[PDB]
Design a protein around this ligand. Structure first.
Ligand code: CL
Length: 182
């Protein structure tokens, strides 16, 4: 798989709530087959995507699913590590819902660096993802470091957290959990 530039990772996955860049979403993905009590991952089922000319990363992932050649008789967990509020863009949650309804052999996990609580459409997109069966949670230090170790061209250098990473993660998590509470 192609590995992400490290400054691109740090700039986009920064979870500082006071920084609200309005351009890009990065989505690191992995597909795991769940079988016999373990998880089986293929390097060819791993990589990252960004928004490209108005087509958002989430939809670009849906676009590549046929190329993954998933066995409909098996169970897969798809994990997204996404740098922006999932399905922020218009109509995105509805397209993910349709995909999940048409592919019941796929379970979607979404780990988000942040969310965008607008007490409106972007907040409702989060509930739509949950209602469609996705498991949505906030990235913690564990996920940021895993993404650094796994998807980034790091040259063996260790993950260096930014100031406030944990404080920001816990605050965002509290809000996401309130939004998705049942
Ligand atoms: Cl969470």
């Amino acid at each position: 798989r192609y590995l992400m530039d490290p400054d691109t990772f740090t700039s986009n996955f920064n979870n500082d709530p006071l920084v609200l860049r309005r351009r890009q979403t990065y989505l690191c993905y992995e597909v795991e087959r769940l079988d016999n009590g373990t998880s089986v991952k293929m390097d060819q089922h791993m990589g990252f995507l960004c928004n490209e000319s108005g087509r958002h990363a989430e939809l670009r992932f849906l676009d590549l699913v046929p190329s993954l050649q998933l066995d409909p008789a098996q169970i897969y967990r798809v994990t997204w590590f996404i740098s922006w509020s999932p399905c922020f863009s218009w109509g995105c949650a509805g397209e993910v819902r349709a995909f999940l309804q048409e592919n019941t052999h796929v379970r979607l996990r979404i780990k988000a660096a942040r969310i965008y609580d607008d007490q409106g459409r972007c907040q409702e997109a989060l509930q739509m993802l949950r209602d469609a069966g996705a498991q949505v949670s906030i990235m913690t230090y564990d996920e940021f470091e895993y993404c650094w170790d796994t998807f980034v061209y790091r040259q063996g250098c260790p993950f260096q957290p930014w100031d406030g990473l944990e404080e920001h993660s816990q605050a965002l998590s509290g809000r996401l959990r309130a939004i998705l509470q049942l």
